[PDB]
Write an enzyme that holds these catalytic residues in place. Structure first.
Site, mmCIF file in Angstrom:
data_model
loop_
_atom_site.group_PDB
_atom_site.id
_atom_site.type_symbol
_atom_site.label_atom_id
_atom_site.label_comp_id
_atom_site.label_asym_id
_atom_site.label_seq_id
_atom_site.Cartn_x
_atom_site.Cartn_y
_atom_site.Cartn_z
ATOM 1 N N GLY A 240 6.201 6.051 -0.435
ATOM 2 C CA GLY A 240 6.880 4.927 0.169
ATOM 3 C C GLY A 240 5.911 3.939 0.797
ATOM 4 N N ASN B 165 0.826 -1.204 0.000
ATOM 5 C CA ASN B 165 0.000 0.000 0.000
ATOM 6 C C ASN B 165 0.866 1.262 0.000
ATOM 7 O OD1 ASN B 165 -1.837 -2.093 1.986
ATOM 8 N ND2 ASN B 165 -2.801 -1.189 0.176
ATOM 9 N N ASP B 166 1.626 1.419 -1.080
ATOM 10 C CA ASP B 166 2.442 2.607 -1.300
ATOM 11 C C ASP B 166 1.573 3.667 -1.968
ATOM 12 O OD1 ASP B 166 4.259 4.570 -1.921
ATOM 13 O OD2 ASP B 166 5.774 3.202 -2.714
ATOM 14 N N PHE B 167 1.292 4.747 -1.244
ATOM 15 C CA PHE B 167 0.467 5.824 -1.773
ATOM 16 C C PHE B 167 1.252 6.817 -2.617
ATOM 17 C CE2 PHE B 167 -2.300 4.152 1.416
ATOM 18 C CZ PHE B 167 -3.570 4.428 0.969
ATOM 19 N N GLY B 168 2.549 6.598 -2.809
ATOM 20 C CA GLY B 168 3.353 7.485 -3.628
ATOM 21 C C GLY B 168 4.577 8.021 -2.917
#
EC number: 2.3.1.-
Lengths: 438, 421
Positions: free
Chosen positions: B367, B362-365
Site C-alpha cells: 500500500g 512509494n508503494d512497496f507492495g
C-alpha cells in the site's frame, strides 16, 4: 472542479447486478420487518461512499455479484401485501432481483474536490450517489442497495445508497468489508472464505408478523421541513485534542465520559453557540445506537439487519450554553444509558397498537450519523485502501457524520451547516484551537 | 522505549566488484556540506515486511551503486585534505527496530518539543557527512509501531540530493512491489552527474573539516493555495507560482511574529535543482547532488511593509538568479576562499525538500504511504515541503520557537489560509 456553473457527469452505463452462487438456491427466504424497520418506511435511502486512487470497474462488478450472493438480503426486494382489514404489511423477499449498478465519469472532478468538499450543497458531489430521492418503501420496485462508481480526473469514488429497513450502518459496512476482500483476492470468490449469514431474526416475542399498519402511500405528513442552502465542511480532531476534550469533560462531569462523547458535546455546544437561536429554544442531539448488545439476549456485531435506533437528548439553548462541556457530555451519556431492552420491547408492543410517543426534533439539532467504530480504511478492493469516506444526500442542517481517522486515535467529521454558522465557526478562536477545519 | 531487533549491511545483489572501483569526485557544493548532518526523511505505512524490503534494497543498490560506496579522505602533500566517493560496495546500514507504544496518529499529527520521541526513528542522528569514510552513505531504519511501520532513512549530501534520493526510493519501492527478489528485474544503467567545472581541478584541496524548538504540521488546502496564488498574482507584475505564493505568505507571517528589528536582515533559503540550469544542462535522471541553496535577502522592514506579491516576487527573482554563470562563479570563488560552515541560519526561512516529489507513489507492495516526515537535525525556521495527497494541497513540517508558535496560532488571518495541526 470545472470552470463555470455546470459540472459534467456522464453516465456510462446502468445495469442490474444479480448474485452469483455456486450452489443451487431452492427457496426464497422472507425477512419480516419489525416496528423499527416499519417506522422508517418513508425515510430516504442512506448514502455513503469511499474515495480511491484506482478502481477497476469490471472486477468491482464481478466481485459485487459474489458479495451479493453472500449478503443475499441486499439483492432482494420489498413486498407489500394488502390485508383484509384495510391495512397493509411489508416483508423482504430474498429473490435475487439484483442491485442497480451505475458507471459514471466526472472528468473535471479531482481528489481534492472530494477531500475538501469544495462546493456548496448540492453542488457536484450529490451527483456521485445513486439513491437520491429514493424512499425505503420504494424498495418494492427499486433495489435495496444501489451502487455508483464514478471515475474522476485522478481517482474513483464508490458511492452506495441503502434501504434502512434491510440493514443498519453496521451491517452495510460489514457488507462493504466482505465485498472489498472478495475483490482483492479473487473476483469469483474462489479464494475468499464464504460464511453463513447470521440474520438478526425476530427478537419481539410478543409481537406477531407480519405487522398490520396503515397504508403509507396515503398517510399524511409527519414532519415539516424548510429548504435552505447549506455548506459541508470537514472537521479534524487530533488524538491530542480528543484527549484534551476528554479530560476537560470528565473534569466537569459526575459520570465517566467517553472521548467521543466529549468531542460530540463540544461540537454541539459550538454549533448552538453560533446558531443564532434564542435561549428558550429547544435543541437536540440525535445519536445512532447499536442495540445488538443492549437486547436480552444480546446478538453479535455479525448479526445482519437493522438493529439500531436513534436516541435523542433534549435541552434548551440557554441550558446548553450556560453549562459547561461536561454537562452536555452528560446529557449525551444519559441519553445513551437509557436505551434498555425492556423499554424497547414495551415501545414496540405499544407502537403496534398505535400507542406512540411523538418524537420532537428541531431544524437546528446535532444529527450525528455513522460511527467512530467503523474501520472505513480496511476496505481495500485490490488497488489500495481508500483515502477518504464521505456521506451523500439527503442534506440537513446539523448533520455530523463521524469517521474514524486515518490514525486510530483521531476523528473526522463531515458537517452540514448553514453558511452563516460556518462563517462564525471559522472565526471562533477557541473552536479552532481544538478542531481543525479543512 | 525503542528496541533494536537487528542490524545488517546490505550490499548490491549482483555484486561483482570490478578490477577498478569507480570514483566520484566531489564539487564545491558537496564539500561545503561536509560538516552538516545527514539529511533524514521517512515514510509511514500500515504494513511493511522487512525481509522483502531488505531483498529489494539489495536489488536496487545494483543500479544505485554509489549509495553503497564510502567516502575516502586523502592527506595531501600540502597538508590539505581531499575527499572522493569510492563505489566499493561496502553496503548500506539497515536497522530493524520496534516501538510498540507509538501509533500512527503520533506521527501523522507530529507536534511537540524537539528532539523528542520521533528522533529515534531515524538512523543517522548525530552523523556528519564527513563520517561517510566509516559509515554508509545511506542508512535505513524500519521501525515497527503499534499499528504501522515507519521507514526512516538518512543520506550523505555529498553523494546525492533530494531529487536523486527520492528517485532511488521510487525505484526501490517499485522493485519491492513487483519483484522483491530481483529474479525478474532489469534496471537501466545509472547516469552520473560527472564534472562540469572545467576551470576547477579535482580533487579540490581543502582543510580537514574535523534552544527549545518545537515541530508542527501545517496543511494548506487546494482552496487556500489557489487563494494565495491569486492574491499574489494580483499584487505582482511577473507571473508567480502557487508554491512561491504560499512560501511567501509563510515567510511574512513568520517574520511578523519573529520579534526582529525592522532594520534586521532576514533570508529565505530554497533548494534549487540546477540540472536544467547549468550550461550544458545535465539529464534530469543524472545522479548525484546537483542542487544548490538560493537565498533571498530583505529587511524585516521591507518585507512587512510590502504585500504578499512583493515577497513572492523576491523569491521568484532569487530563483531567476540561479544561473549557470552564478553557479560557475560560486565554484571558482569557493575553491579559492573555501567555506565549510557548521550552520549559518536560525533566523531565516529554511525551505527544504520539494513539492515536486510524489510522496505517495512509494508503494512497496503493501500500500501507498500515509505520510512523509523529516527527522533530525532540528533547526529554527526549517520548513520541509511535502506534496499533499490531493492535486494541489501542501503539507509543511515546521521547526519554530515556542513563542513563535503561540503567536502563529492566534493569528486569525494565518489560520484562515493555513491549518495548524
Amino acid at each position: 472542479a470545472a470552470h463555470g456553473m455546470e459540472e459534467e457527469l456522464v453516465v456510462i452505463s446502468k445495469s442490474i447486478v444479480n448474485p452469483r452462487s455456486l450452489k443451487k438456491p431452492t427457496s426464497v427466504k422472507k425477512i419480516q420487518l419489525t416496528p423499527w424497520d416499519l417506522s422508517r418506511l418513508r425515510f430516504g435511502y442512506l448514502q455513503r461512499g469511499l474515495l480511491f486512487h484506482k478502481i477497476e470497474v469490471k472486477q468491482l462488478q464481478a466481485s459485487l455479484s459474489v458479495a451479493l450472493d453472500r449478503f443475499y438480503p441486499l439483492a432482494g426486494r420489498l413486498v407489500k401485501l394488502k390485508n383484509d382489514d384495510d391495512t397493509v404489511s411489508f416483508f423482504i423477499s430474498c429473490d435475487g432481483s439484483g442491485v442497480e449498478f451505475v458507471h459514471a465519469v466526472a472528468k473535471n472532478i479531482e481528489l481534492s474536490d472530494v477531500l475538501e468538499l469544495s462546493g456548496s450543497v448540492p453542488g457536484f458531489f450529490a451527483s456521485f450517489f445513486p439513491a437520491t430521492g429514493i424512499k425505503n418503501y420504494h424498495g418494492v420496485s427499486r433495489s435495496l442497495l444501489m451502487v455508483q462508481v464514478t471515475e474522476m480526473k485522478d481517482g474513483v469514488f464508490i458511492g452506495f445508497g441503502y434501504n434502512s429497513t434491510v440493514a443498519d450502518a453496521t451491517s452495510i459496512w460489514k457488507f462493504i468489508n466482505a465485498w472489498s476482500e472478495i475483490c482483492s483476492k479473487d473476483s469469483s470468490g474462489s479464494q475468499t472464505f464464504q460464511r453463513r449469514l447470521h440474520l438478526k431474526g425476530w427478537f419481539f416475542d410478543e409481537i406477531d408478523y407480519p405487522i398490520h399498519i396503515p397504508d403509507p402511500e396515503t398517510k399524511p405528513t409527519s414532519y415539516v421541513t424548510t429548504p435552505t442552502n447549506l455548506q459541508e465542511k470537514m472537521f479534524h480532531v487530533t488524538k491530542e485534542n480528543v484527549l484534551k476534550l476528554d479530560a476537560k469533560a470528565n473534569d466537569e462531569a459526575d459520570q465517566k465520559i467517553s472521548s467521543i462523547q466529549a468531542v460530540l458535546a463540544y461540537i454541539w455546544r459550538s454549533m448552538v453557540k453560533h446558531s443564532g437561536m434564542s435561549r428558550e429554544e429547544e435543541t437536540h442531539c440525535r445519536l445512532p445506537i447499536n442495540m445488538r448488545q443492549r437486547l436480552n439476549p444480546p446478538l453479535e456485531e455479525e448479526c445482519f439487519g437493522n438493529v439500531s435506533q436513534t436516541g435523542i437528548a433534549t435541552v434548551t439553548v440557554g441550558e446548553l450554553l450556560d453549562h459547561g462541556l461536561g454537562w452536555a457530555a452528560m446529557q449525551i451519556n444519559n441519553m445513551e444509558l437509557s436505551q434498555t431492552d425492556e423499554k424497547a420491547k414495551a415501545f414496540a408492543e405499544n407502537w403496534v397498537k398505535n400507542i406512540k410517543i411523538p418524537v420532537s426534533v428541531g431544524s437546528k439539532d446535532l444529527v450525528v450519523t455513522n460511527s467512530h467504530r467503523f474501520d472505513v480504511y480496511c476496505n481495500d478492493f485490490g488497488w489500495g485502501k481508500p483515502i477518504a469516506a464521505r456521506a451523500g444526500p439527503p442534506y440537513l442542517n446539523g448533520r455530523l457524520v463521524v469517521f474514524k481517522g486515518i490514525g486510530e486515535a483521531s476523528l473526522d467529521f463531515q458537517a452540514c451547516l448553514l453558511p452563516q454558522v460556518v462563517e462564525k465557526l471559522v472565526k471562533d478562536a477557541e473552536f479552532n484551537e481544538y478542531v481543525s477545519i479543512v
